[model samples]
Target: SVKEGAQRKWAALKEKLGPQDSDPTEANLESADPE
Candidate 1:
């Protein structure tokens, strides 16, 4: 259950982080969203 818990934890963290907005090609990751 460790991997499952990790996935859940990461999923929650991602939700708190809000979407994949850390792409270097992204002009602004700190705009409407962040990662």
Candidate 2:
């Protein structure tokens, strides 16, 4: 469920960023749990 949740959040963030966007902020990755 963690992977699914992370993927969903990732997609949502990516959608918000749209195409041709830079990398995510530290806070973003933090919330996404980069472990």
Candidate 3:
């Protein structure tokens, strides 16, 4: 069966993590294990 692109598509979304370090909001989001 053809693998679902959606599952692998995260590669694209992951790259979408542009240089937004200034935004602590994303920091919280990316920290995943946020405090």
Candidate 4:
């Protein structure tokens, strides 16, 4: 019922992946994990 959840996930993915110029492993992947 929540569309924002997908957005949140996508944002998390972006943060996990970080910028194209930056290193992928540099960002913390823990954010992608659900509580």
lDDT, model 1: 0.66
- Candidate 4 minimal-lDDT segment of 10 residues: 26-35
The TM-score, computed over Cα atoms with residue i paired to residue i, of candidate 2 is 0.37
Q: What do the candidate models score in CA lDDT, each in turn? A: 0.66, 0.70, 0.67, 0.62
Range of the 10 consecutive residues with the lowest summed lDDT in candidate 3 = 14-23
Question: Which model, 1 or 3, shows the larger TM-score?
Answer: 1
RMSD of every prediction: 8.7, 6.8, 3.9, 7.1
lDDT of 1 at 30: 47
For candidate 2, write residues 1-35 as lDDT tens digits.
98899887887786857666555685576586664
Tens digit of per-residue lDDT, candidate 1, span 1-35: 98898887877766747666556656465466653
Residue 3 error for model 1, in Å?
A: 1.2
Question: Which candidate number maximizes lDDT?
Answer: 2
Task: Estimate TM-scores for all models.
Answer: 0.37, 0.37, 0.29, 0.34
Please write out the lDDT profile of model 4 over residues 1-35, one tens digit for every residue.
38988887777777746557654564446457443
Superposed model 1: Cα runs more than 4 Å off: 19-35
Give the runs in model 3 whose Cα sits over 4 Å from its true position. Answer: 1-3, 21-35
